[PDB]
Design a protein around this ligand. Structure first.
Ligand SMILES: Nc1ncnc2c1ncn2[C@@H]1O[C@H](COP(=O)(O)OP(=O)(O)NP(=O)(O)O)[C@@H](O)[C@H]1O
Ligand SMILES: O=P(O)(O)O[C@@H]1[C@H](O)[C@H](O)[C@@H](OP(=O)(O)O)[C@H](OP(=O)(O)O)[C@H]1O
Ligand SMILES: [Mn+2]
Length: 265
C-alpha cells in the first residue's frame, strides 16, 4: 500500500476515492493538524498515490503503535451486501478456528467460509473493540521488532499493559501522548468534518522516540463516509443498524482513561 516519495519528508499511499475525499476536506477542517498533511495526488507506474507527510520523519528511531478506533469496524452497507449476495471468505474462516474452534457455526464449518461482517464482528468481540471502542493492532520499532499479536487483547488492564510495555517507563512520552489525546478529543468535538462523517476503520497512530518526542495522528480514511443531508452522529451512543454510529469517541474516552490510569501507577 505504501511507496517512497521523491521529496524529503513525504510518503506515498495508493489512492482510494473515499480517502482522497476525506484528506482534502480535513486540510480545511479543525482536524487539519491531527492528521498527516495531504499534498495532493501523483502518478507512478500508471497508478494514483496520495502524497502524505511521513509522520516518522521528525523522530530518531521511532516506536509506533497503531490503534483501530471504533466499536464497529465495517460499513453498514457490508451487512446489506452479506444478506443479498454473500461473498464467502475462506481465509477468515481459518483464523476463527485458530483463536476459537467453537466460534464458527455448524453451517460455517460446512462452508469453510464466513461473511466479512461476520468475521469483523467476531474480531471486535474477542478484542477490546466492542467493550472499549478501540483496539491495539500492532507495534513497530526501530529496535526492528514488530508485533501484530493482539487479537485477544480485550480487558482494560490487558490494554494498559501493552501501553506500559510500549512507553517503557518514559514519563515524558506518556504525558505528551496524554496531552495530545486531550487536544485531539477537543478538536474532534468541534470538528465539522467529524460530526458529519461516519469514521470506520481509521486508527490513531502513536509515535515516540528515545529523545522523548511523542506525537499522535488520525490515519486511514478509506472507510470514512459522509452522512446524508445534515444528519449527524454523537460518536458515543451504541451502534444499532440504521443509526450509523461508530463509537469513535467512546473509544477515545476509554483510551485517554487508560493512559491517565497508567500515568498514576
Ligand atoms: N502518513 C504516514 N506516515 C508514516 N507512517 C504512516 C503514515 N500513514 C500510515 N503509516 C503507517 O503505515 C501503517 C499502515 O497505515 P494505514 O493508513 O492504516 O494503511 P492501510 O494499508 O490502508 N490499512 P490497514 O490494512 O488497516 O493497514 C500504519 O499502522 C503506520 O505504521
Ligand atoms: O485485520 P484483519 O483481521 O486481518 O482483517 C482486515 C482488517 O479489518 C482491514 O482493516 C480490512 O480492511 P478495511 O478496513 O478496508 O475493510 C480487511 O478487509 P478486506 O479483507 O475485505 O479488505 C480485513 O481483512
Ligand atoms: Mn488502517
Amino acid at each position: 500500500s505504501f511507496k517512497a516519495a521523491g521529496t524529503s519528508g513525504l510518503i506515498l499511499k495508493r489512492c482510494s476515492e473515499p480517502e482522497r475525499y476525506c484528506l482534502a476536506r480535513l486540510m480545511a477542517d479543525a482536524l487539519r493538524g491531527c492528521v498527516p498533511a495531504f499534498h495532493g495526488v501523483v502518478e507512478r507506474d500508471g497508478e494514483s498515490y496520495l502524497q502524505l507527510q511521513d509522520l516518522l520523519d521528525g523522530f530518531d528511531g521511532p516506536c509506533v503503535l497503531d490503534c483501530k478506533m471504533g466499536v464497529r469496524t465495517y460499513l453498514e452497507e457490508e451487512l446489506t451486501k452479506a444478506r443479498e449476495r454473500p461473498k464467502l471468505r475462506k481465509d477468515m474462516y481459518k483464523k476463527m478456528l485458530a483463536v476459537d474452534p467453537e466460534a464458527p457455526t455448524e453451517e460455517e464449518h460446512a462452508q469453510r467460509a464466513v461473511t466479512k461482517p461476520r468475521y469483523m464482528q467476531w474480531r471486535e468481540g474477542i478484542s477490546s473493540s466492542t467493550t472499549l471502542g478501540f483496539r491495539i493492532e500492532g507495534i513497530k520499532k526501530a529496535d526492528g521488532s514488530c508485533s501484530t499479536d493482539f487479537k485477544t487483547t480485550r480487558s482494560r488492564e490487558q490494554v494498559l499493559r501493552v501501553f506500559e510495555e510500549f512507553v517503557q517507563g518514559d514519563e515524558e512520552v506518556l504525558r505528551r501522548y496524554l496531552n495530545r489525546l486531550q487536544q485531539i478529543r477537543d478538536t474532534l468535538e468541534v470538528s465539522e468534518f467529524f460530526r458529519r462523517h461516519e469514521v470506520i476503520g481509521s486508527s490513531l497512530l502513536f509515535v515516540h522516540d528515545h529523545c522523548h518526542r511523542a506525537g499522535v495522528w488520525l490515519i486511514d480514511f478509506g472507510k470514512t463516509t459522509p452522512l446524508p443531508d445534515g444528519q449527524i452522529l454523537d460518536h458515543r451512543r451504541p451502534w444499532e443498524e440504521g443509526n450509523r454510529e461508530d463509537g469513535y469517541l467512546l473509544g477515545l474516552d476509554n483510551l485517554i482513561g487508560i493512559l491517565a490510569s497508567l500515568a498514576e501507577r
